Design a protein around this ligand. Structure first.
Ligand SMILES: CN(Cc1ccccc1C(=O)NCc1ccccc1)Cc1ccc2c(c1C(=O)O)OC[C@H](CCC(=O)O)O2
Ligand SMILES: CN(Cc1ccccc1C(=O)NCc1ccccc1)Cc1ccc2c(c1C(=O)O)OC[C@H](CCC(=O)O)O2
Ligand SMILES: [Cl-]
Ligand SMILES: [Cl-]
Lengths: 149, 149
């Protein structure tokens, strides 16, 4: 499970926030895109996999699962592309809670930037650094390092 | 040194590739931008610092050191902004070598994408996964996890 990630798409201000969540740690990366296309999703996964050791991605919906551009990115980056069916129903609730948390943080910073993308990156920073006591950023590094060793 | 990063700007195809290098590991993040501005640099640092525990950034040039937008990003993200003067002359050679390596990789993948940004992300992936035997991606995680513990 050190290599498992989950995609998540949420909406704000008539734009799309694409999120990848490292399941085991709750660490996230995110970007603002005008719309959630296969090409946007593919590029996002390519970035993610160059930065972290991404073994498996649970796609956020059936369109991204189906997308041959997304499949091409997963092939390129050596990622196992999987569906995102919540066989464990707790997954649904976790993601919904996360989207609510992120939107709350974006609200708290929204006046510190003109553009939504800046606010989203501020929210990523706050989420990943928040101690709950370790932070998600500490947890992901410890989980992966333990795996390497 | 787990928290020390160096900025680096290189050019290709009439575009700018902005790179951050984790000094102790050689791990990199990079993006393609139309031009180096304070705003682009500030946004890049904001992204980097939300993803890794960035303590100190050696700026790539004096304009980015001076830029009040870059200083504002460093303030926001809790980064110590420093100059990039190669007091150790080996620094110069390392960054030059890295730029040549990255451009080499970009050439090797260039026909696998229409857009330069895609090729740059492929190059980031290849660089960070390359075993030198550990990869830069393994070294950065080990270095940071050892720091946390
Ligand atoms: C579609 N294209 C096809 C292609 C075109 C030419 C040669 C090979 C291929 C090919 O299939 N390569 C294999 C491959 C490797 C990795 C990932 C996917 C496929 C690749 C691609 C995907 C997402 C992008 C791209 C590009 C691009 O061509 O550069 O460009 C920027 C864009 C930014 C986000 C947005 O703007 O949506 O995301
Ligand atoms: C310039 N602006 C000033 C500002 C405007 C309104 C309110 C507060 C501030 C303010 O000073 N906040 C403190 C602050 C926090 C964090 C970093 C820097 C400053 C902030 C900013 C920087 C880089 C960006 C932005 C933005 C934006 O406003 O959203 O937008 C996307 C753009 C993308 C890259 C490109 O397009 O160059 O990079
Ligand atoms: Cl972090
Ligand atoms: Cl990696």
């Amino acid at each position: 499970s050190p290599g498992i990630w989950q995609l998540d798409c949420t909406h704000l201000e008539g734009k799309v926030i694409l999120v990848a969540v490292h399941v085991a740690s709750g660490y996230i990366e995110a970007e603002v895109i005008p719309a959630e296309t296969g090409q946007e999703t593919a590029y996002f996964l390519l970035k993610l996999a160059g930065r972290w050791p991404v073994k498996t991605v649970h796609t956020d919906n059936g369109s991204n699962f189906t997308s041959t551009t997304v499949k091409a990115a997963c092939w390129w980056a050596g990622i196992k592309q999987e569906d995102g069916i919540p066989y464990n129903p707790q997954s649904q609730g976790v993601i919904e809670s996360m989207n609510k948390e992120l939107k709350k943080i974006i609200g708290q910073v929204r006046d510190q930037a003109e553009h939504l993308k800046t606010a989203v990156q501020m929210a990523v920073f706050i989420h990943n650094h928040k101690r709950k006591g370790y932070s998600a950023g500490e947890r992901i590094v410890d989980i992966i390092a333990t795996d390497i060793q």
